[PDB]
Each structure stands twice: as C-alpha cells, then as structure tokens.
C-alpha cells in the first residue's frame, strides 16, 4: 500500500517491521559495567568498537615483548661498547654517535670480520626473531574459535555491585555462633569504658 511507502520515506523506513528484541537488564540489578568483550565469528566484518580491544591487546603484547630485547639489545650494545674500547676509542664521540657509529669503520681486520659479522649477524637474527614472534602473536590476537551453526556473534558485558551491611546481616563466628543485626545502633548512646572508647 502507498502509505507504507510514505512512512518509509518519512523516517528512512526506520528499520520498519524489524523487531525490537534487546538485552535490556532485568530489575533488581544496578551498578556499572566492568568490561565488554563481543567475540565475533571469522568473516563477519565486525568493525564497530571490537577493534579497540584488539589494538589494546596488541599494545599489551608489544609492550610485554619489547623489554626483553631492549635488555638483550642493551647487552649487545654493552659487548660492542666493550670491544670498541680495545682500540680506536673516541670516547664521547662514540657516545654521541649511536647505532654502532656505522660499525666504527673496520678497526682491525680481526675486529672487522669478527666484530662486524657477529654484531650484524646477531642483531639481524634478533630483529627478525622479534618480528617473527610479533607476527605469530599477531595471528593469535585476531582470529576466531568454534561456535554453533546458528550463532553469528556474541556480546558479553560484566557488572559489579557494592553491597553494604544492613539489619539483614547473618554474620557468623569461628565457634559456631550465628546471629543477625537487631538494629543499627548510633555511637553516642552505646556503653563506653573509663577512657571513653565505645564498643
């Protein structure tokens, strides 16, 4: 009928007859949201906000794997800093010229072949190894698991509630003593010792 097409022209159809079903929280529940996950199936083209936790976990993995080869790289620069002292020591110059100071020329031929081959070889294998671990863990970050044939994606939200003591109570002791709070008693009317400390 035409009036349905008119209604579709007004609001842009506003999804029209497509239903309202939602996750809305039942009553008796309050508090904030701890975390949101939203796992997705492979090939869903999710976009939305689900890439933010992907980038966050990627930053966590990068920050976790960086310090190891920063310390080990500091050890490489420590052994290079140790071998460059044996000859041709420019002191602050070599201190103001980082990145191996372009190998510091050739120095002696033995230090040329041994020091240059060891520094470039070990350094290249450490860089390529870190890139390999980072790409493998990168394959681990973005992926999907097994799921039911009739499910597309699943959203997960966590909640938290602060609950404070009230006359309901039911605290227990270690000797087997039960009990409940009869009333909430103000401070000023309770008994106190000779020093004035209330019970």
């Amino acid at each position: 009928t035409p009036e349905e097409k008119l209604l579709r022209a007004i609001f842009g159809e506003k999804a029209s007859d497509v239903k309202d079903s939602s996750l809305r929280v039942p009553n008796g529940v309050s508090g904030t949201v701890i975390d949101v996950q939203v796992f997705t199936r492979d090939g869903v083209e999710k976009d939305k906000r689900a890439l933010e936790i992907e980038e966050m976990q990627l930053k966590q993995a990068k920050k976790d794997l960086s310090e190891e080869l920063q310390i080990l790289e500091a050890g490489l620069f420590s052994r290079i800093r140790a071998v460059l002292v044996a000859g041709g020591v420019e002191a602050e110059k070599l201190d103001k010229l980082p990145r191996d100071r372009w190998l510091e020329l050739g120095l002696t031929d033995e230090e040329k072949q041994n020091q240059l081959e060891q520094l470039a070889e070990q350094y290249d294998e450490l860089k390529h190894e870190f890139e390999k671990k980072l790409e493998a863990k990168r394959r681990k970050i973005t992926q999907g698991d097994d799921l039911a044939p009739g499910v597309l994606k699943i959203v997960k939200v966590y909640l938290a509630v602060k609950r404070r003591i009230q006359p309901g109570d039911k605290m227990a002791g270690r000797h087997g003593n039960k009990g409940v709070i009869s009333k909430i008693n103000p401070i000023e009317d309770m008994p106190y010792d000779e020093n004035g400390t209330p019970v």
């Binding site: 109570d169 039911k170 409940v180 009333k183």
Partner: protein, 151 residues
C-alpha cells in the same frame, strides 16, 4: 523476609518494612489517590507511585491503619502456627516480630525466612480480628495451659 527482634510492638503488631508495604497495598494506594482528589488517570497515579512523592507515604499511613496482615511459616504444626498482626512501618530490609512468642512458631532467629499473606475481601478483616489475632488466644488448643510464657 528475615525476622528481627525488638523491644516494642505490643502483642498485636509487627514491624513491616516500608519497601514491602508499598507494593502490597498498591491497589489501595490507587484507590485512595483517585479518591482524596489528587489524580488524573490510573496510569498517572502509577507514575506518582514510582515517583514516590512524600505525600504517597502519608496516604499509606492512612491505608494500613486498622487493617492487619497474616503471617505464615513454611511448616504449620498446629492452629496457632499462623497469626495476624497490625503492621507498623519500620526502616529496614527485615520484618520485626513480637518477642513474647518463640513457642507457637517454634523457631528462634538464625535468619529464617517468613511469609506474609494479605487477605482483603471485606469480612476477611473481621475474620482476621476475631478468630486469628494473637491477643484473642492466650491458650493452646491441645492443653489449656497458658502459652506465651516469658523467658
């Protein structure tokens, strides 16, 4: 709800939490709000109910009044196991019961949970204030020896 003892509430009465009282007497709230002259429609009266104005509790005070309520445990081992009492609004999440009877209910307070039934009708009020209210029966039907002995 859970029962808590207190040194008041003469033998016919019980402490009724205000959060529990508002929902049980809700239809009487609708009736007296439509009656006393502040109202428009029943749905707007509801709107006033969940908006909880300070006048609504002033209504409820006159709602409860002389119209007592029934108490029930899960077990009933005799006739007196259930009794009626006059509600009195008390702040808390727990119900307050009169101390003098630990016997007819047979249960001390470990935090046991208790049931509260509200009859309405009309003559159910008199039926509640005649053959049920605790001040009417001071004796046990199987003996004749006085119950509710202090301890």
């Amino acid at each position: 709800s859970v029962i808590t003892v207190g040194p008041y509430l003469r033998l016919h009465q019980c402490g009724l939490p205000k959060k529990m009282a508002l929902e049980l007497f809700k239809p009487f709230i609708y009736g007296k709000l439509e009656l006393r002259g502040l109202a428009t429609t029943i749905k707007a009266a509801k709107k006033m109910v969940e908006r909880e104005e300070a006048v609504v509790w002033d209504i409820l005070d006159e709602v409860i009044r002389e119209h007592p309520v029934l108490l029930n445990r899960a077990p009933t081992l005799h006739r007196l196991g259930i009794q009626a009492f006059e509600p009195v609004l008390i702040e808390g999440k727990a119900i307050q019961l009169h101390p003098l009877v630990c016997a007819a209910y047979n249960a001390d307070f470990d935090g046991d949970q208790m049931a509260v039934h509200v009859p309405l009708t009309l003559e159910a009020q008199l039926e509640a204030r005649a053959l049920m209210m605790s001040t009417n029966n001071i004796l046990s039907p199987a003996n004749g020896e006085p119950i509710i002995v202090p301890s």
